[PDB]
């Protein structure tokens, strides 16, 4: 919508 | 006896090595490929392409040599009776040092293989630069453009009229640069075949699967022949592999014969189902044993000349990614029947 982040599948973990 | 004649025990080691490197074995996969390829050869009947897929070590080269020699021996009475008639022709596609395949090089080398093994016969091609010479080596001038060489090849291949043009290591066609299509490189050979009425059999590893099905025309006038390995899921090919191993052990000119079927798992782990790799390994261990005057082949000799684990994993993954696509099942005809509208 307006100001809403795209439904991205965020990777996890510390690189 | 089914083994080696024992008189080589006194003969020098070179004769033993020559025997072990010149022995050929017959196994059902090779026989099936041979029969299918020869039956396709006897009549293309519209088909203008043969794709002989294999693996790394199954022995596609030995199959091609056997077939070439077979039609050579077939046509030998006709070759003696009639000249200007080569039964089959063969060429290895060059791996280019440049980024793209050299069509000009392919044409000139094909003309070399079709002309050079022929006596100084007065045949004139419709081109200027390519001509004969006193020594008999027909020379293509460096100023001759590629399509002129292709026209000369067409004239030579309709005059000689061979049965099959074999292109070994045909995967080197796929070594295409810039932004061509891998199908743009096969319409040329399709036109060659459809103009000269010549069957073109292409041999290569699993990468040659990239040309497998590119266009409707490129697949209608084409057949595919698979040089299947010795698998592990199906026990009959395991027994066949054991039979070939027994034959190799029986035809080993050693002083005392070891038993090579008890290490069958270790043999298959470094051969993956390919006969040529097994032959190559056995020749290596034979040479090592014969240099030290060894009377037997032990497991240490087998391990010292075995292939690396990483290599084996490499070829195995290549084989898997190859024949995963090369699988025809009942669903493949069921869905065709459904989509055609017959049901």
């Amino acid at each position: 919508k307006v100001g809403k982040r795209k439904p991205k599948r965020d990777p996890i973990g510390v690189q | 006896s089914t083994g080696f004649p024992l008189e080589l025990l006194t003969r020098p080691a070179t004769e033993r090595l020559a025997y072990f490197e010149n022995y050929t074995v017959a196994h059902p996969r090779l026989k099936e490929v041979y029969e299918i390829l020869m039956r396709t050869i006897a009549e293309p009947a519209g088909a203008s392409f043969i794709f002989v897929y294999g693996a790394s070590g199954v022995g596609k080269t030995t199959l091609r040599l056997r077939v070439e020699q077979k039609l050579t021996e077939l046509a030998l009475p006709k070759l003696e009776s009639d000249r200007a008639r080569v039964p089959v022709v063969g060429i290895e596609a060059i791996a280019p040092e440049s980024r793209y395949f050299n069509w000009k090089e392919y044409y000139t080398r094909a003309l070399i293989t079709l002309e050079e093994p022929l006596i100084d016969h007065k045949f004139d091609y419709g081109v200027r630069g390519i001509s004969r010479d006193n020594f008999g080596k027909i020379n293509v001038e460096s100023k001759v453009v590629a399509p002129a060489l292709r026209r000369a090849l067409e004239n030579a291949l309709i005059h000689r009229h061979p049965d099959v043009f074999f292109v070994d290591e045909a995967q080197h066609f796929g070594k295409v640069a810039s932004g061509y299509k891998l199908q743009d490189q096969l319409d040329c050979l399709k036109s060659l075949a459809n103009m000269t009425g010549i069957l073109h059999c292409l041999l290569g590893t699993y990468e040659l699967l990239t040309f497998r099905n590119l266009s409707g025309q490129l697949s209608r006038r084409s057949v595919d022949i698979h040089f299947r390995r010795y698998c592990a899921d199906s026990p009959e090919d395991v027994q066949a592999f054991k039979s070939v191993l027994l034959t190799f052990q029986q035809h080993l000119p050693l002083a005392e014969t070891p038993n090579l079927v008890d290490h069958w798992e270790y043999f298959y782990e470094r051969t993956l189902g390919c006969i040529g790799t097994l032959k190559d390994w056995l020749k290596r261990v034979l040479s090592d044993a014969l240099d030290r005057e060894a009377t037997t082949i032990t497991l240490k000799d087998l391990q010292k000349r075995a292939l690396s684990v990483a290599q084996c994993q490499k070829m195995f993954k290549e084989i898997q990614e190859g024949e995963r696509q090369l699988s025809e099942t009942e669903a493949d005809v069921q869905n065709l029947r459904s989509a055609l509208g017959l049901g």
Binding site: R5, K6, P7, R9, D10, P11, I12 | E321, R324
Partner: protein
């Protein structure tokens, strides 16, 4: 990664279209971002199985199933907001309507794959009493079933399952939240002397 999936498909003989759906679900962003709504605590959870953030609409309905799937070995992967399925079903009147629906999770296991939808008690009862041919209860396996979801699963080589919150053991959830910190670690090495000490104290006294 692709070779193992290909062998999975070959072993389970999934059809071409079923393989197409599985491939699409595997490589696709979630269809819709979870909205806060008005009564559901929403959010995201880090999953080391997938290794990504998975979105839950309800922290006490879908999230327990997500916890199970993350700590379940039978499950290989569990995608969230899979692409919409046009479930076709006949209503009470008789008209066969096709409604777009997004399953809560798409679970790929070691012997099967399919859709899993998380709902609550009262939601399931109201939907069943308002739609006779969309949800019903099987007392044999004591499970809730949706006719068009399972029909679409059976036309594609997949399965369809409804996870309610009656069957979730909350003690399991509490203990998973207790030991999740140790689960997320990667090099748990207990000193051998201390481990032997506890092993002796444990074997000397059962039920401690």
């Amino acid at each position: 990664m692709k070779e193992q999936f290909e062998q999975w498909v070959a072993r389970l003989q999934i059809s071409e279209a079923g393989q197409k759906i599985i491939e699409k679900v595997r490589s696709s962003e979630p269809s819709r971002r979870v909205g806060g709504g008005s009564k559901n605590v929403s959010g995201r959870y880090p999953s080391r199985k997938m290794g990504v953030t998975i979105q839950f609409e309800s922290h006490r309905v879908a999230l327990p199933i997500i916890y199970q799937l993350e700590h379940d070995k039978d499950v290989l992967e569990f995608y969230d907001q899979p692409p919409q399925i046009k479930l076709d079903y006949q209503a009470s009147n008789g008209r066969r309507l096709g409604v777009l629906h997004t399953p809560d999770l798409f679970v790929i296991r070691t012997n099967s794959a399919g859709w899993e939808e998380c709902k609550t008690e009262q939601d399931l009862k109201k939907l069943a009493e308002k739609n006779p041919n969309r949800y019903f209860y099987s007392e044999e396996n004591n499970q809730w079933h949706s006719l068009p979801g399972e029909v679409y699963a059976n036309q594609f080589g997949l399965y369809h399952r409804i996870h309610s919150d009656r069957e979730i053991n909350w003690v399991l959830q509490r203990n998973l939240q207790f030991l999740e910190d140790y689960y997320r670690s990667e090099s748990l090495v207990v000193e051998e002397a201390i481990a032997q000490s506890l092993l002796a104290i444990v074997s000397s006294q059962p039920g401690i």
